[PDB]
Structures are given as structure tokens and as C-alpha cells.
Design a binder for this molecule. Structure first.
Ligand code: DHE
Ligand code: DHE
Ligand code: HEC
Ligand code: HEC
Lengths: 526, 529
């Protein structure tokens, strides 16, 4: 006989459930099928059994599962409660409306009591806000001295950082929908406001229309299917919008359309919201939240990430499972093109904009499913025949690429290969010389930088990910992402010589992943 | 379970599926998606177990004169389907299904392609003076000559027929039923008939046509109670072009609402937009139909319980009742925003499209009567020339009694007609109140009214005749009222001479079964009210 799975009173079950959706669902999923954390459905957990679940929740694991019991985040009774709850069938995922957001909303420092000018000595625009994935923190690193200025707690499941248009406020979002607002002008920068906007979420963005600096922030959730516009100084939740709706092509109701990347228009006072499963791109005008104007653009399903072109007018985003790039004109508020990249699973991040020597302005992306790099023409006025067409496709290090990067002041295009199965490749970066490109059909050659080897890290599984440039566009940073119980680092590459500039190492630099330069993020320079 | 005490004569899964399809397709328009009843009674298990199999089988077989079709004896459901349904109704209520593009397209039929239709009117009818009258329990509409008063044609649309609307040019007649059935009729044919049809949901009430200058006959839109959605359709073929879900957040508490019904739908005359009331979330949508792929909409926070409403006399401002909250919500359709929300001081305002007129002392006003009390309320509708009266309730006075549904006037007339359809007294419910607009002063003295004995003029005694909804002819000189009696009883339409307030003519015919809504082509196509 299989061990006995205990009762649980209504109160206990209600208590367990609140904990699950508030603190576990960001990594284990609202239906318990897993996300960064393993699936915890009862077909799996009953086999593991109570003792095993209790031990894991008490001690955590170095692969990213918090030590709930030993950290005192959960009491001994709460730990047993959760182990017992995981042996039961998955509960119905709850909604998360205004009442729930406002209960979680905290303003630690009201706007009137914050500084009126920068009170620290830091070079805010050249700071790098780095995600410490399994530590639940971000590191604020000086872009010139390479010193860790501070390490701030945001919360387990920390995902990425974004900056307000003025560069004063640092916004961080976690996979649980937790949002932290950090005031960079304080003597000792810390969280001045926080709020939770759902159970699962990935994106956040700030108002970037000139004249709307610091007015609003917007966050998108995976569950429930909604986005929220918040006050840009206090995080007060002002407008919640459901994304449930019809698919663009079959026009069938879809009960769970996740919000993916959220960007901000520089032509109009609008947020640009990708709705994944229905294939809709939303242009949301924040001029008036009560008489709310939006444009719901039929695009392509599987929208994920993307970026604005060099002129900041057009939004280019990957509909990744269908291998397409979708192009929106933010000035006219309309779809302008849909093109296949020729590769498998394009994953641009915000992508890489540059001026090709013969094609004109282009935007590039690499792929998760193959080694190709694709370029799309982005200049309807000056290069009409090249506009929104794939002009070239060439191989980089290998499949498993996540991020491509460049900067106006650099002649090089950097491509990672983070998820490649071969350590030599996943620990390296491909670099192309833009000035040597000809678009004559021949594959441009690349130099291979041994980033992980340069950091002196071989133990564990160090994966190199995401180039990020400093404010001047002279140095590019890469994360050497190793396990929490392993040695990690950040490698700074001298852009002009393509030589190692510096290796950042520190006991607090745990699982570093996303890196965001204040100036480059606030101005959308990529 | 079937052999257990509490147990019911099961249907295999497949039999259940067939019954469930019949239920949602043919019964839910009147009995409700959760079987809680609408026009038809609740059919939930609590009640149906006490009727028992044989009662249900006979009720579904024979029907009744209250509006329930005789599915069995008409041949509409074969012998076995009746039993299936009777068995089905004893079971727990199924989860209401979605109704997307695939299901709409399966129901979409184009009987006469546009290429094959007339290029000019091929009958000799006076189309703009025609009246389209809903024959409720007959599942038909009657097309009636507005001057000779003869029934030109009786057309089958479907059980649960609700109301009629006209395309902007007056050529196409659109009718919607409570089951979401949409019929398009071409009034230019020698013998006008349905040229296209489609189904847009399981439960629905509204339909409307594009009225922006330049977009005449381009689009039609239908709104549903279930599923919670509206659909924009091609104005000539009924092809479903865009389906939009109305599921979303309430305007005030900002909490998700899984089933926000679509109530009235009107059309802007200032922008190429449809005006959609979303009842439970309290949102009014301004939907721009110039580009359905890059869809522009304005989601206006208003007040919950939005139901019916109309445009002011200038056609710029939408005025709609949030009925359970006793409020009028006013939207500026030129600027696309909320401009006011006001309490009428009455209970449950039910304006229909309302009544616009020029009050001698207040200026332009729009009026509504109420279901819950005898009051008539007036709101100022001219912010430009009468800014101190604009969007203010300027007067409130009594008409015949509570239970009023429709109030009506016309630019060519000085009278304001008010019905009292649901009043418990037959004496009141068979009459209509009429106020002289020219004698109104606005000093706080209730305007007096003349009582027209509309049911008595009809010369009907049997059943329980109720008078509903004034509708004028094209020239604004005669106003029609429906004398709604039961299906197996005699009904009529009464035509009143506006200038003398005397009986003009009584329309009676064997085919005139339960006449309710009446829509004059010209006054509907132009929004004259
Ligand atoms: C929707 C989304 C965005 C765009 C945010 C915005 O527009 O504000 C994004 C951006 C990002 C960006 C933005 C980079 C930029 O330059 O804009 C980075 C670095 C990033 C690093 C990672 N992402 Fe993130 N990421 C997801 C979703 C997203 N990632 C996932 O659904 C996914 C695949 C799985 C998951 O469970 O979360 C996932 C896993 C990862 C990682 O494993 C990465 C590599 C490392 C990590 O920190 O967990 N994601
Ligand atoms: C949403 C809605 C509209 C506006 C449509 C538009 O904007 O195109 C409307 C209009 C109407 C109009 C339009 C009048 C006008 O001048 O615009 C009429 C005459 C009408 C006669 C009736 N309505 Fe209708 N009506 C409902 C809903 C609606 N009715 C109901 O939810 C309700 C209360 C119950 C029901 O189950 O359907 C209902 C019962 C009735 C009746 O019992 C009426 C009186 C008679 C009948 O035919 O069933 N409704
Ligand atoms: C992300 C920051 C996490 C949060 C928040 C929670 N969990 Fe987790 N959990 C996470 C990971 C990455 C893993 C896999 C660890 C590994 O060593 O591979 C886990 C694992 C578990 C387990 C063990 C499951 C198994 O071994 O099959 C359990 C029982 C579990 N997690 C429970 C749990 C609960 C109850 C949480 C809320 C208190 C919770 N986790 C949060 C990542 C994350
Ligand atoms: C609107 C046109 C209807 C449609 C379509 C269907 N029904 Fe109906 N039904 C309707 C009314 C107005 C009434 C009340 C009749 C009365 O005399 O008061 C009914 C009643 C029933 C009943 C009897 C309930 C009772 O007596 O308490 C049953 C079992 C019933 N209806 C079933 C039914 C089915 C199975 C239908 C689909 C084929 C159906 N109805 C359609 C109005 C309308």
C-alpha cells in the first residue's frame, strides 16, 4: 500500500493555497506543470512522497529552489502544510484583480520624502543592473571601475531590469509578478515601492514618449492573462486590462493569452504589448486611462520578444514558433510586414540594429533552433526595395543562441550560443565585422571569443549569455552563468581590440544572467 | 449511477452530445445558456425532476400558446429527439460552449449572391414608409405599408425573433432573434426575402448597421449575451469579419468578469464607429470599422448595468440607461469620451432609443420613462447653446403609471407619447399617455397629459392585450402602437393621427400574431427620434 496522504482542514487548505499562488507558482506554474521549477503535479509528487517533499521545501536545492524552512520564510508547520498540499490535485488558478494588487502595494518612501537631486556619487548612466538569478537579487555594478556598488534584494524568481526614461528609477520584475521600484538618487539606493501584478509574469516597461518621462510603468503577466499600467512614481495600480480574447487567424476564443515583451513607443504616448497565443500586438495609449484608446493589431501567433529599429519608429518582433518577424509602424499604428527569417525559432531579445555597408539600415536576430543570423532591412524611405525583407542569413557559432548585440559606436556584431550542447560553443561568442560585410551572398566570417575560458571557469556548466554595452559603446559585457554552488563571472571585452578587458568575480555574484546598462536601456540604444 | 435511487435514465455520451447540441442551438435562445430561463421558463434539475419525463416529453411535443414551440407535432424534432431532450433536461446543466469563427461560418448561408441581386428596386412598394413588425411567437416579421396599412409580406426569420434594423441606404433589412440568428433581407427584390443568414452566438439581442456618411451598407454588427462577444459582418453578405470578446475587468472595482453581456449597439454619425454597451463591466466601446486588422477601439469606463439608449437630436452624444443603478450615462461620440453620469430620480429607466425634443424653456432635451415607477425624466442635450442645462436632469413628472417601456416623439410633432406596457392594471397597460411639448414650462408643475385608450380603440376583448412602443411613419404625421395579445388570441396595430390625437386606423389580420416591435424604414435608417 502506497503511503497515506493526510486530510487537511478547509482552513489549512486555504492557507496552503494562498502560499502556493503567492510564493511557488512563479517557478512551479499556476497549474503546477513547472516553469524554472519542476512540475509538482500529483502523478509525480505522490511517488516522491511526503518525506521527500518536506525535505526539499525545508532545505531547498542549489539549482534554484529556495530553502523555505531553513531560511525561516516558512515555519515548520507551513512546510508540512505545503508538502501535504502538493500530494493533492492542483487547485483552480485564481484571478488577481485590483483588490489583490492594492493589498500587495507598498510605498516605502513617498515621493515627497525622496531626494530632489542625486545624493550619491555614482555614475548612474554607466551603471549595470545585473540579475542574480538564484539569489533573488540584482547587482548594481559601476561601468567604469567594475566595482559592485550594491546588491539589492528584489525577491526569488527575479527576471529582468528596465529603466525610467529619465534614468532615475530602476524597475525590476520577477517571474512571480513581483515589481520593485528603486530610486537611484538616494544616498543608498533601495526599493521605494513594490507591488505584485499577477501569479506568473515576465515583462515590465516605462513610458518613453518625450514629455511622459516617469509618468507610467506597465507590467505584463502570464497568469492571469492581463497587463497593468501603474503610476511611474508610486507603482499605484491604475488600469488593469484582460488579454483573454480571440486568435487573430482562426478567430476562436483563447482563455489564456500570455503577455510577452512590452516595449514603449517614441512616436506616440503608447505602450507596445505582445499577446502571445492570440497573435495580437497592442498599442495602448496612456493619455487617458478611463476613455482608453488602443489599437489591436492582428499579427502572428507565438509573439515573444523584439525591439525597435534604429530610428525608433518600427517595432520588430519574433513570432518564434512560426519563425517569423512581425513589423509594426508605431507612427501609423499598423502592421507593415510579416516575414520568415529562414531559421528555426528566432530569439532576438531587443535585437541588433546597424548600417550594413551595401544594404542600408538593418536589424539582426539570431536563433535558438539553428546557427543562423538573419538581417532585415529597416529603411522604407532610403532603401525601399530592401525594406522589411530578409536580406542575408549566415551562420554563427551554433544553435542555441539567445542574444545578438551591437552599438552605434562599434563595428562589431556579437552573437552568443548559450544553450548549445557543446561547452566550447556555449562558453564562447561569435563576433562579426560589420564594415567587412558585402551582401554578395557569401557568409561573413566571425572571430570566436573564448569568454568562459577568459574568465578561468571550467567546472560546472558555465553558459555565456547576453552582450550588453557600456554608455560609451567602448566595452561589451557578457555573463558567465554558472550554477549557484559554482563559480560565475562577468567578462568585459574591449570593443575596439576584441580583447579581454576585465573579469568581474565576487562571492555575491551568484548566477548572473541579464545585464542592463542604465543609459542604453533608458534610451533604447541597441 | 442510473440504477441508484436518485438516478436518471441515462443517455450514452453520444446521445447526451446530440441533445446538448439541440439545446444550445434551438432552446437556449429562450431558456438560457445555464437553463435559468429567459423568455421561456427555467429548466434546471430542481424543477424538471418534479415535472418528470412524461410532462417534458408532452410539453416539448405539443408546446403551448405562451410561445413554446410544438417541436413534436410540427416535425421540427423527430419522435426520438423529443425523448432525448426530455431525458437531457433531467440531467445537470452542461457548460455553455464557445461560438467562434468556425461555428459562425458553418451557420453562414448566402441564398442570393450580391452579383445576382437587383441593381435597382424591382417592386413598387414605398420602401421608406414600410414598417417592419416583429411577430414574436410566430418567429416572423411583417412588412406593412405605412400609408395603405396593408401587410405586404410575412417573412420567416426564426423562433425568438427580436427586432429589426435597417442599413443606412434603406435597402437592407436586418433582423436578429434571441438565439443569435441574423437574417438579411433585400427590400429591392420583386418579392423581398432572406438573401443571407448567420448565427452569431447562443443568446443575443442587438444588431446595427454602419451609419457614418461614406460607409452606407458597408457593415453590420451583432452583440451577444452568450458567449460574451460582438461580431462585425460584411454589410452585403453577412460574412463574419471580426469577432471581439467582451470578457474583461469591471470599470469600478477592476476585477475580472467572465461573462459581460452585450446590450444595445448603436452607430456613430461623427466617426466610422459602432457604439457597444457592455452591461456587467460597465464599459461603452467605440469600435472603429475603417480597419479591422489594425483595430482601433476606445474603451470607456461608464456605469454597470448598461442596457438601452439613443443619440441626442444632433446625433453627437450617446445617452444610455444604466438601468439597475437608475443612471443616464452620456458619451461624446466626436471626442470619444464620457461626459456625464446622472441619476434620473426614477426607478429603472428604460428609454428604448428615447425621445429628443425642443422644450420651450429648457432647450433641446432627451427623455426616458421608467419600468419601476410612473416618472418621465428630461436631460438637457445642448452643451453649446445651453451649457447650464447640459447633461442635467431638468424635470421629472408622472405619466400613466409604472411599467413603462417606450417613450416617443418626432420632429414634425408637438406630442410626447408614453406607454405603460407592464403596469398591473389593464386600464393603464392598454392606454398611452400624451403630453403637449408646446405647453411645457418647467416651473415644477407636472405637465398634464391626454390618455389615449389604445387597446379599447382596437376593439379586442379576449386575452390580455398590452400596448407597447410608439413608432412614427416617415412624414411624422401618424404614430403606430402594437396591441400585443397572446399567440392564439387577436392582436392589432393601432394608428393614431398625430395632429388630432384621434384614431386613424386599426390593423387586424389572422397573420398578425403577437406584434411587438415596429420599425419604420426611414426613421430607423436615419435615427430620427
Ligand atoms: C517575455 C520575456 C522577455 C521580455 C521582457 C520585456 O520585454 O520586458 C524576456 C527577456 C529576457 C531578457 C532581456 C534581454 C534584453 O537585452 O532585453 C533576458 C536577458 C532574459 C534572460 C532569460 N530568460 Fe527571459 N524568459 C522568458 C520570457 C521573457 N524573457 C521565458 O518565458 C523564459 C523562456 C522561461 C521562463 O520560465 O522564464 C525565459 C527564460 C530566460 C532565461 O533562462 C534567461 C536566459 C536567464 C534568466 O535570467 O533566467 N529574458
Ligand atoms: C439589448 C436590448 C435591446 C436593444 C437592441 C439594440 O440596441 O439593437 C432591446 C430592444 C428592444 C426594442 C427596440 C425599440 C426601439 O425603438 O429601438 C423593442 C421594441 C423590444 C421589445 C421587447 N424586448 Fe428587447 N429585451 C431585452 C433586450 C433588449 N431589447 C431583454 O434582455 C429583455 C428585457 C428580455 C429578454 O429575454 O429578451 C427584452 C424583452 C423585450 C420584450 O418583452 C419586448 C417588450 C417585446 C418583445 O418583442 O419581446 N426590445
Ligand atoms: C524559483 C525561484 C522557485 C520558487 C519560488 C519555488 N521553487 Fe520549488 N523548485 C525550484 C526549482 C528550480 C526546483 C528544482 C530543483 C533541482 O534541484 O533540480 C524546485 C524543486 C522543488 C521541489 C522538488 C521536486 C522534485 O525534486 O521533483 C519541491 C517539492 C518544490 N520545489 C516545492 C516548492 C514550493 C512548495 C514552493 C513554494 C513555497 C517552491 N517550490 C518555490 C524553484 C522554485
Ligand atoms: C422561444 C421561442 C422558445 C424556444 C426556442 C423553446 N422554448 Fe421551451 N418554452 C418557452 C416558453 C415561453 C415556455 C413557457 C410555456 C408556458 O406555457 O408558460 C416554455 C416551456 C418549456 C417547457 C415546460 C416548462 C414548464 O412547464 O415548467 C419545456 C420542457 C421546454 N419549454 C422545453 C424546450 C426545449 C427542449 C426546447 C428546444 C427544442 C425549447 N423549449 C425551445 C419558449 C421556448
Amino acid at each position: 500500500a502506497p503511503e497515506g496522504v493526510s486530510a487537511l482542514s478547509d482552513a489549512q487548505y486555504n492557507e496552503a493555497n494562498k502560499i502556493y499562488f503567492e510564493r511557488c507558482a512563479g517557478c512551479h506554474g499556476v497549474l503546477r506543470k513547472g516553469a524554472t521549477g519542476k512540475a509538482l503535479t500529483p502523478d509525480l509528487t505522490r511517488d516522491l512522497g511526503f518525506d521527500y517533499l518536506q525535505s526539499f521545501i525545508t532545505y531547498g536545492s542549489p539549482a534554484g529552489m529556495p530553502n523555505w524552512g531553513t531560511s525561516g520564510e516558512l515555519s515548520a508547520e507551513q512546510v508540512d502544510l505545503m508538502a501535504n498540499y502538493l500530494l493533492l490535485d492542483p487547485a483552480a488558478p485564481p484571478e488577481f484583480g485590483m483588490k489583490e494588487m492594492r493589498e500587495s502595494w507598498k510605498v516605502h518612501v513617498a515621493p515627497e520624502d525622496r531626494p530632489t537631486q542625486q545624493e550619491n556619487d555614482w555614475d548612474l548612466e554607466n551603471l549595470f543592473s545585473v540579475t542574480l538569478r538564484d539569489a533573488g537579487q540584482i547587482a548594481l555594478i559601476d561601468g567604469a571601475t567594475y566595482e559592485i556598488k550594491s546588491v539589492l534584494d528584489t525577491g526569488y524568481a527575479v527576471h529582468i531590469s528596465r529603466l525610467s526614461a529619465s534614468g532615475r528609477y530602476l524597475f525590476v520584475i520577477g517571474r512571480d509578478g513581483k515589481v520593485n521600484m528603486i530610486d537611484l538618487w538616494m544616498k543608498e539606493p533601495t526599493t521605494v515601492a513594490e507591488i505584485k501584478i499577477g501569479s506568473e509574469a515576465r515583462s515590465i516597461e516605462t513610458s518613453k514618449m518625450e514629455g511622459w518621462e516617469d509618468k507610467y510603468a506597465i507590467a505584463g503577466a502570464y497568469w492571469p492573462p492581463q497587463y497593468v499600467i501603474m503610476d511611474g512614481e508610486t507603482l499605484e495600480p491604475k488600469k488593469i486590462q484582460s488579454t483573454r480574447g480571440m486568435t487573430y487567424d482562426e478567430q476562436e476564443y483563447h482563455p489564456e493569452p500570455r503577455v510577452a515583451a512590452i516595449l514603449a513607443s517614441h512616436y506616440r504616448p503608447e505602450f507596445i504589448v505582445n499577446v502571445k497565443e492570440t497573435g495580437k500586438i497592442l498599442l495602448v495609449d496612456y493619455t487617458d486611462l478611463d476613455n482608453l484608446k488602443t489599437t489591436e493589431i492582428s499579427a502572428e501567433r507565438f509573439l515573444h520578444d523584439g525591439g525597435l529599429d534604429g530610428s525608433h519608429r518600427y517595432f520588430i518582433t519574433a513570432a518564434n514558433a512560426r519563425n517569423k518577424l512581425v513589423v509594426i509602424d508605431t507612427k501609423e499604428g499598423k502592421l507593415v510586414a510579416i516575414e520568415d527569417t529562414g531559421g528555426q525559432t528566432p530569439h532576438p531579445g531587443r535585437g541588433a540594429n546597424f548600417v550594413h555597408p551595401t544594404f542600408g539600415p538593418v536589424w539582426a536576430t539570431s536563433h535558438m533552433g539553428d546557427d543562423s543570423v538573419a538581417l532585415i532591412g529597416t529603411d522604407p524611405e532610403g532603401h525601399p526595395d530592401n525594406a522589411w525583407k530578409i536580406l542575408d542569413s549566415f551562420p554563427a557559432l551554433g544553435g542555441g543562441s539567445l542574444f545578438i548585440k551591437t552599438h552605434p559606436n562599434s563595428q562589431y556584431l556579437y552573437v552568443d550560443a548559450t544553450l548549445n550542447p557543446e561547452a566550447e560553443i556555449s562558453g564562447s561568442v561569435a563576433v562579426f565585422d560589420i564594415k567587412a560585410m558585402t551582401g554578395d551572398g557569401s557568409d561573413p566570417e566571425f572571430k570566436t571569443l573564448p569568454i568562459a575560458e577568459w574568465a578561468g571557469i571550467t567546472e560546472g556548466q558555465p553558459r555565456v549569455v547576453q552582450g550588453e554595452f557600456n554608455k560609451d559603446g567602448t566595452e561589451v559585457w557578457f555573463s558567465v552563468w554558472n550554477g549557484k554552488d559554482q563559480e560565475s563571472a562577468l567578462v568585459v571585452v574591449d570593443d575596439k581590440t576584441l580583447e579581454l578587458k576585465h573579469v568581474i568575480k565576487d562571492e555575491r555574484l551568484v548566477t548572473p544572467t541579464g545585464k542592463f546598462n542604465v543609459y542604453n536601456t533608458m534610451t533604447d540604444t541597441y
